C-alpha cells in the first residue's frame, strides 16, 4: 500500500517508537506516584485540578500537558481498579 | 506551598519538560519532511494516525500524537 512509503506513514511510524518510549519511561513513575496519592473516586477530581494547577504554575508546554494527560490516565485506572 | 499536589506537579513539569525536550526536535524534523499546510494539515494528520496506530495503541502513542497534532497546527500557523 502507498500510507507506509508515504511522508504520512513514515512519521506515523516514528510516532509509534516515541509514543512507545514515553511510556517506557513514565508508566512505572506514575503507578508509583499514584500508589503514594491513593486517588478514590471521591477525590480524583481535587487531586488531578490541585495537580494541574501547580503544574502549570511554571509555565505550559506540549510535554507538560501530555505528561498531565498520561498521569490522567493512569489515574483513571488507579481509581477504576480500586474501586471494583 | 506546603501541600503534596504541589509537590506532585512538580514532579510532573519536571518529566513533561524531559518530554519536551526530548522529542521536540524530532517533531521539528517530522515538521519540516511534511512541510504542512492549512489545506493538507487534517489530511496529514490523519493519515499519520492511521500508520500509528496499525501498530498498536497504548496511552504512551495516544499523548505523542496529540502533542503532535499540536505542534503540527503551531507550525502552521507559525509559518503562515
Ligand atoms: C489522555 C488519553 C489517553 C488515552 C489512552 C487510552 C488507551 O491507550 O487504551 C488502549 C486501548 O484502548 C483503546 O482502544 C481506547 C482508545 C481511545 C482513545 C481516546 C483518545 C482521546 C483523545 C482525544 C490501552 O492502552 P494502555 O492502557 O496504555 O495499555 C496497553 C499496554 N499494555 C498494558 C497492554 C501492555
Ligand atoms: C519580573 C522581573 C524581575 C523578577 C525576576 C525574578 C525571578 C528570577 O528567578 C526566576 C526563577 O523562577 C522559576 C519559576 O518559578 C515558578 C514560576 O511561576 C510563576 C510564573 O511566572
Ligand atoms: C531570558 C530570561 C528568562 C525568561 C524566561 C521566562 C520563561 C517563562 O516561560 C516558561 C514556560 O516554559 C515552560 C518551562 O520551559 C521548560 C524548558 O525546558 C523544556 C524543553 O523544551
Ligand atoms: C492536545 C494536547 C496538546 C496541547 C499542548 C498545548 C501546549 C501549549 O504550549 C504553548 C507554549 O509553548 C511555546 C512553544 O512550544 C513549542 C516550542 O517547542 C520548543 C522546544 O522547547
Ligand atoms: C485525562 C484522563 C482521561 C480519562 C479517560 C480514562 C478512562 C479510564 O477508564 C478505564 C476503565
Request: charged share 15%.
Amino acid at each position: 500500500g502507498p500510507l507506509g512509503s508515504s511522508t504520512m506513514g513514515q512519521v506515523g511510524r516514528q510516532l509509534a517508537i516515541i509514543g512507545d518510549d514515553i511510556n517506557r519511561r513514565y508508566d512505572s513513575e506514575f503507578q508509583t506516584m499514584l500508589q503514594h496519592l491513593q486517588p478514590t473516586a471521591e477525590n480524583a477530581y481535587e487531586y488531578f485540578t490541585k495537580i494541574a494547577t501547580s503544574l502549570f504554575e511554571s509555565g505550559i508546554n506540549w510535554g507538560r500537558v501530555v505528561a498531565l494527560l498520561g498521569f490522567g490516565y493512569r489515574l483513571a485506572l488507579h481509581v477504576y481498579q480500586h474501586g471494583l
